[PDB]
Amino acid sequence: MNFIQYIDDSYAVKVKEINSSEGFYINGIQTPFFILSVFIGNKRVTGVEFNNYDSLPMLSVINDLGNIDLNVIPQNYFATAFTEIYFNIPF
């Protein structure tokens, strides 16, 4: 079970599954979102990156393992809705 934890526009934590066909990709959020964490095989992974989307803040948030505070990230870093994001997980 591969799934991502992300916050919507209203700063609410939600979980969405990942489609593993022809790679790892996510789409159809329907709202501005900021990806928080990625889980592959019911475990937390680090060192992931996007091969088509350039965004340092989400990479920095994902790669850190400790608990984070949602009061430090502004609305600027939020990605636009209906965005196709691909994952490159090391293995």
Residue numbers in the entry: 1 to 91
Q: What do the paper's sentences say?
A:
Following the approach applied to the MCPs, we calculated a localized reconstruction of the internal part of ΦCjT23 spike (penton domain), in addition to the FLiP penton base from our previously published data. The resolutions of the localized reconstructions for ΦCjT23 and FLiP were 3.4 and 4.0 Å, respectively. In contrast to FLiP, the entire spike of ΦCjT23 is made by one protein, P13 (283 residues), which forms both the capsid-internal and capsid-external parts, analogously to the spike protein of phage PM212. The capsid-integral part of the spike, corresponding to the P13 N-terminal penton base domain (residues M1–F91), sits in a slightly raised position relative to the type 1 MCP trimers circling it. The penton base domain is a small β-barrel (SBB) with a β-strand topology that differs from the topologies of better-characterized SBBs29, and from the canonical β-sandwich fold observed in pentons of other viruses such as FLiP and Bamfordvirae members. The ΦCjT23 spike SBB is formed by anti-parallel β-strands β1, β2, and β4, and additional β-strands β3, β5, and β6. The region connecting strands β5 and β6 include a short α-helix (S55–D64) and a long loop (L65–F78). The α-helix resides at the monomer–monomer interface. Part of the loop (L65–N71) faces toward the central cavity of the pentamer. Together the five loops close an oculus in the middle of the pentamer.
